Structure 1
Amino acid sequence: QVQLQESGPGLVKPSQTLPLTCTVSGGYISSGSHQWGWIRQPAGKGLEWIGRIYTSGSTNYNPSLKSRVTISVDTSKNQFSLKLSSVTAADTAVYYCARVNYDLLTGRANFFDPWGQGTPVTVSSASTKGPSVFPLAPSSKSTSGGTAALGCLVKDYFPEPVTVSWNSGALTSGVHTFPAVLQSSGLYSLSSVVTVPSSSLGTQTYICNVNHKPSNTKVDKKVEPKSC
């Protein structure tokens, strides 16, 4: 069956161009009744069309993106590419390459099956930085009905992702990992909280394992009730 695989930088500073390439396997671009196009999906929003291309080299673009979008086809290597210019922080999204159906009589773009795997892109000028783990120590304020809660706070890290685990994966029940939120400064931050019985606070000293691939930083911090 036909398969598609994206490829791109994944992190572009503002005002540059965004080069993406989609490689087709299991099918030939030239011999077929399909076009090939790109779609995106900004975080927490719906799908947005970008454009298409045919083996003959004819293209169609979104009217709201016609000025910046540029799509090209390389039938020799069985690939098609995207070039989005003047990128801005509003262009952060997950980009997909699909196989566009079309009508023989008019040549217009029909539904979009199948799709690619997708590839996230972040548009920001912030530089890579490690996290700052802080302990959310449990307290009587966070204890209700004999059950206490606690967490490990991550702040001022960029870019995604951050993997947080408790006791090297030994503790999995009650583990909550809050999705990261962008801050005004341009840095992400998230809090991981796990609920544990109050009686067990004085028996186990929990550990929040924080790892950050982009900066190759691995930090472990122990969470215990505050002495105050």
Structure 2
Amino acid sequence: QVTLRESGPTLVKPKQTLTLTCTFSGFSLSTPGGGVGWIRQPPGKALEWLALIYWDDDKRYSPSLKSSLTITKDTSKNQVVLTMTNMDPVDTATYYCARLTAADTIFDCWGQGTLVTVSSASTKGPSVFPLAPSSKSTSGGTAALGCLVKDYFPEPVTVSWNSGALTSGVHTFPAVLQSSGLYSLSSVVTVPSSSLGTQTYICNVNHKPSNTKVDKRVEPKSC
């Protein structure tokens, strides 16, 4: 009933003006006690309150960020815009779009949150390459397929097999930044070594900054 899905840019240059949005539906910003705010959380620490607007055009800001955080509302299209300047390499976090239906219930329902990294590098293309079992792939019986992707700076990325059709039992576990400066993640979807040539496996990668909807089928490759 409450879809606080965030949208907008994910990569930003140092010392710039960032703009985040989160489209909401299922409610309004006119009932008494309503409120839409922004909450971020750096990976590895606790959460910190950024701002919280109300139904009476009251824009409450954080005591530390009193000048950068300038949040505005848009009731005509049900969108909340958050503006912040002075992009320091400390603002990297997952910004959650919050909803305050009443004062007693502090942020009852949340959204999903997007990870905005603060660096100076640009975006790179995907490296979709299937991982078929080989002569040295039999260790205990597990020979699951994969399409490991690397050589990409923007961390937020998902793996969707057959556009979300054969995604039953997917164990795609992301990773962190390596020593070179490029992320990497593989798919650990539970598919036995028997049913690999019958079904079609196309992991549709979804790159948000680069907009690269490349596709690559997975088949049993020989030597």
Give the TM-score taking structure 2 as reference length: 0.66
Note the aligned Cα RMSD (angstroms): 4.1
5+ residue gaps, structure 1 = 103-109
2:177 equivalent among 176, 182, 189: 182
Return the index of the structure with the highest Cα Rg. 1
Per the alignment, residue 96 of structure 1 pairs with 97
Per the alignment, residue 131 of structure 1 pairs with 127
Whether 1:71 and 2:71 are equivalent positions in the alignment is yes
Label 1:139 to 1:18 Cα distance change in 2 as closer, same or farther (>3 A): same
Give the TM-score taking structure 1 as reference length: 0.65
Label 1:151 to 1:33 Cα distance change in 2 as closer, same or farther (>3 A): closer
How far is 1:130 from its partner? 1.8
The structure richer in helix per residue is 1
Per the alignment, residue 215 of structure 1 pairs with 212
Corresponding pairs, count: 210
How far is 1:131 from its partner? 1.6
Q: Is the 8 A contact 1:142 1:148 kept in 2?
A: yes
Summarize the alignment of residues 46-195 of structure 1 with structure 2, pairs less than 5 Å apart. Answer: 46-73=46-73, 80-88=80-88, 90-99=91-100, 101-102=102-103, 111-123=105-117, 124=119, 125-133=121-129, 135=131, 137-139=133-135, 142-144=138-140, 147-152=141-146, 153-157=148-152, 159=154, 160-163=156-159, 165=161, 176-193=171-188, 194=190
How far is 1:189 from its partner? 1.1
5+ residue gaps, structure 2 = none
The structure richer in strand per residue is 1
Label 1:164 to 1:33 Cα distance change in 2 as closer, same or farther (>3 A): closer
Looking at structure 1, the residues matched to 4 and 168 of structure 2 have their Cα atoms a distance apart, in angstroms, of 33
Aligned partner of 1:120: which letter?
A: T
Looking at structure 1, the residues matched to 4 and 159 of structure 2 have their Cα atoms a distance apart, in angstroms, of 25
Aligned partner of 1:61: which letter?
A: Y
